[PDB]
Each structure stands twice: as C-alpha cells, then as structure tokens.
Amino acid sequence: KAKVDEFPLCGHMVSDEYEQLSSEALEAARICANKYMVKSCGKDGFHIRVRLHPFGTVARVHIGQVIMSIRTKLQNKEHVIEALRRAKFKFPGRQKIHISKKWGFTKF
Ligand SMILES: [K+]
C-alpha cells in the first residue's frame, strides 16, 4: 500500500530536457536523495521512487517528465526540496523541482 495519508507532501524532480539517462546516473541520484532524506527525516520518514524505466540500462526522458518523486510529512517540505536539488547534480541537462499534494500519473 502507498502511504498517501501519512506522507501527503510530494516533491518531484521534473525534467526540462530530452535525453537518455544511464542506470548509473539514475541510481546515483536516488542514492544522493535517499541519503539526505534519511539523515534529515529518518530512514522511515519518507518514500522515494525513480519514475523512469528501464531501471546496465538506459532510460529516456522528455521535457516536463517526472524523473523522481518523494513523499513525506508536510513538516519536511524543505528537506524534500534540498534532497531533489542535490540529486539533480547526478544528471546532465536542466531539471526543475515541483512540490504538491498530488503524486501524478501517466494519462491519455
Ligand atoms: K542537472
């Protein structure tokens, strides 16, 4: 089950570049974001996930496409921003950070 009720604040690393991202860069970024989150919110104070596939491998990203998402308690908003802001260093091109109560999903 997804802790949507307990971790209502969502942070999203939104791509602003079209490009291929290696499994190594994506994992690096997840490590980075995870590390800061555990020491800032507690190993169980959040949920993190890479929204790209295949996840060596290579994954494609489009402009405006979510790369990574974190959910936690409203009080940790600032830590999420810092987690995503650091992690975006493992990826070339430009990335943006979006905060909301929605996790988002692919739709047609
Ligand atoms: K970057």
**3 state DSSP class of 97:** strand
Q: What residues does 46 pair with on adjacent strands?
A: 72
Task: State the Cα–Cα distance between residues 93 and 14, nearest whole angstrom.
Answer: 12
Alpha helices, H only, the chain: 23-41, 77-87
**Which residue is listed with tokens 């169980």?**
44
Quote the ligand 1 centre to 2 CA distance (angstroms): 28
Domains and CATH numbers, the chain: 1-108 (3.90.1170.10)
- List the Cα angle 29/82/58 in 5-degree steps: 20
Q: Six-digit token pair at 73?
A: 């308690």
CB half-sphere exposure, 31, CA atoms < 13 A: 9
Q: Six-digit token pair at 46?
A: 């959040």
Task: State the Cα–Cα distance between residues 42 and 45, nearest whole angstrom.
Answer: 5
Task: State the Cα–Cα distance between residues 94 and 88, nearest whole angstrom.
Answer: 8
Quote the ligand 1 centre to 3 CA distance (angstroms): 29
CB half-sphere exposure, 48, CA atoms < 13 A: 26
Quote the ligand 1 centre to 96 CA distance (angstroms): 9
CA 7 to chain centre: 14
> What are the C-alpha distances in Å from 52 to residues 23, 29, 41?
10, 12, 24
Quote the ligand 1 centre to 92 CA distance (angstroms): 4
Of 34, 36, 11, 22, the C-alpha closest to 97 is 11
Q: Which experimental technique did the depositors report for determining this structure?
A: X-ray
Quote the ligand 1 centre to 41 CA distance (angstroms): 24
* Ligand 1 ion: residues within 5 Å (CB): 88, 91, 95
